[PDB]
Write a protein that binds this ligand. Structure first.
Ligand SMILES: [Cu+2]
Ligand SMILES: [Cu+2]
Ligand SMILES: [Cu+2]
Ligand SMILES: [Cu+2]
Length: 490
């Protein structure tokens, strides 16, 4: 296996605008086939990257900045990863979803709004080349990634992911670590062949290739490098932790026993910070955290992982994320702060997660037993608030993502799965459990654990139109755990 901690952590450059005035900002981003070395001891890997970079450039914007992005496809006309034609016209389709963006529906990256190279061919919902991000929303860690119909697991795995940070200037009074002490950590597990090429499985009378129900990579990367190290000064740092992996959930900790200070979730700052010894981070979740290296001068500290992916973690491989080396000399005094008080925050629908089987014996994962192409059923009225009760009788956790909105977690409550299985009866085996401090703020991707009913409260706005909701395990999303969502307007 590849030698851990021999490559420095890349920090993606911040994208510079093509045009910026006091009232509009214009970006252009091209998807390019490119080659990048993922580890000291590997030949360069063929990847698909935004602006030919992996991860894509970090986009930084201000709350309410009027932002436009022209996302362009400069990619080959055939894919280099295994395509399964049975889960359903150009072979390569792309569309960019700004995950967590409060976005009008024609700029949200609808799966059927894809386009091929140079917009030559476009899907049925294609409408515009330049996407509009009004950014009228809390400061927060967003990220952007491909969302093309039936291809999302492959296009993201190929490298099409990037960070997107909304800065709210009113938060600058909290004096949280900033500038070079504010670092995104995009975590992606991959399997890499001896020759440096990406491996993605082509099989689980099955079709060949065949989609797989889950992908667990052999190696962990952060910001596009295998098991990297980051030299840090002995002071406070802010890290924007993004799980950009297809399937893998991480459970992070520090091997010197230190704590994290969580300050933010998907939808922005928590109401109050939380000292944590460890945390779970499923696909597309983000943790905004502070690590205080002040008391750890000279130490090497491993960011460790304890969560299995198709088996227990391997102490020599996926038990490891990255290594901090507290050996950078202090440039200036640490003027940053770790406040404990961060922010002040002032119909019912029932949805069933379940899996069936297709004609080939493969599992198909479904929301409410509906296919993607079935007529829409989740149709809340713009401006209305709903409580969604998400019932999970399956064996595993599903990280559920609702587009457009962020939501509040009400509670989780266990139920007997065998009983529910047959009579369809919701017989609770314990009291509801309110969200921990980590989930007392705003979320947009939420772990619905096995054998539990999860309740969330969302207000559906400010925009109306056609959106989606789905599991963010991309191997589930593509087959077929995704549904349209119409926010209706009278
Ligand atoms: Cu996403
Ligand atoms: Cu999303
Ligand atoms: Cu799922
Ligand atoms: Cu989505």
């Amino acid at each position: 296996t590849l030698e851990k901690f021999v490559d420095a952590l890349p920090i993606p450059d911040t994208l510079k605008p093509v045009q910026q005035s006091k009232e509009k900002t214009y970006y252009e981003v091209t998807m390019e086939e490119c080659t990048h070395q993922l580890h000291r001891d590997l030949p360069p890997t063929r990847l698909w990257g935004y602006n030919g970079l992996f991860p894509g450039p970090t986009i930084e914007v201000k709350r309410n900045e009027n932002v436009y992005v022209k996302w362009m496809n400069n990619l080959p006309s055939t894919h280099f990863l295994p395509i399964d034609h049975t889960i359903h016209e150009p072979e390569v389709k792309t569309v960019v979803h700004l995950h967590g963006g409060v976005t009008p529906d024609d700029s949200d990256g609808y799966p059927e709004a894809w386009f091929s190279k140079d917009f030559e061919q476009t899907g049925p919902y294609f409408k515009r080349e330049v996407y509009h991000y009004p950014n009228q929303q809390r400061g927060a860690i967003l990220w952007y990634h491909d969302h093309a119909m039936a291809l999302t697991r492959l296009n993201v795995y190929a490298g099409l992911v990037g960070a997107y940070i909304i800065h709210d200037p009113k938060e600058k009074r909290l004096k949280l670590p900033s500038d070079e002490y504010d670092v995104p950590l995009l975590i992606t597990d991959r399997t890499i062949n001896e020759d440096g090429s990406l491996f993605y499985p082509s099989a689980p009378s099955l079709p060949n290739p065949s989609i797989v129900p889950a992908f667990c990579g052999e190696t962990i990367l952060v910001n596009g490098k295998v098991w990297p190290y980051l030299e840090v000064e002995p002071r406070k740092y802010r890290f924007r932790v993004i799980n950009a992996s297809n399937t893998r959930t991480y459970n992070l900790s520090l091997d010197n026993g230190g704590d994290f200070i969580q300050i933010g979730s998907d939808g922005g700052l928590l109401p109050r910070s939380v000292k944590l010894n460890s945390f779970s981070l499923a696909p597309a979740e983000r943790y905004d955290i502070i690590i205080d290296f002040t008391a750890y001068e000279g130490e090497s500290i491993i960011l460790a992982n304890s969560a299995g992916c198709g088996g227990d973690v391997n102490p020599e491989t996926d038990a490891n994320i990255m290594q901090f080396r507290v050996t950078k000399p202090l440039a200036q005094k640490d003027e940053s702060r770790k406040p404990k008080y961060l922010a002040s925050y002032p119909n019912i629908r029932t949805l069933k997660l379940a899996g069936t089987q297709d004609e080939y014996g493969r599992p198909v994962l479904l929301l409410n037993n509906k296919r993607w192409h079935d007529p829409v059923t989740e149709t809340p009225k713009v401006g209305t608030t709903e409580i969604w009760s998400i019932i999970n009788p399956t064996r595993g956790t599903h990280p559920i993502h609702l587009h457009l909105v962020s939501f509040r977690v009400l509670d989780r409550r266990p139920f007997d799965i065998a009983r529910y299985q047959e009579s369809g009866e919701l017989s609770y085996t314990g009291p509801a459990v309110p969200p921990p401090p980590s989930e007392k703020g705003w979320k947009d991707t939420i772990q619905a654990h096995a054998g539990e009913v999860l309740r969330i409260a969302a207000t559906f706005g400010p925009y109306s139109g056609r959106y989606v909701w789905h599991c963010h395990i991309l191997e589930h999303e593509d087959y077929d755990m995704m549904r349209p969502m119409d926010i209706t307007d009278p």
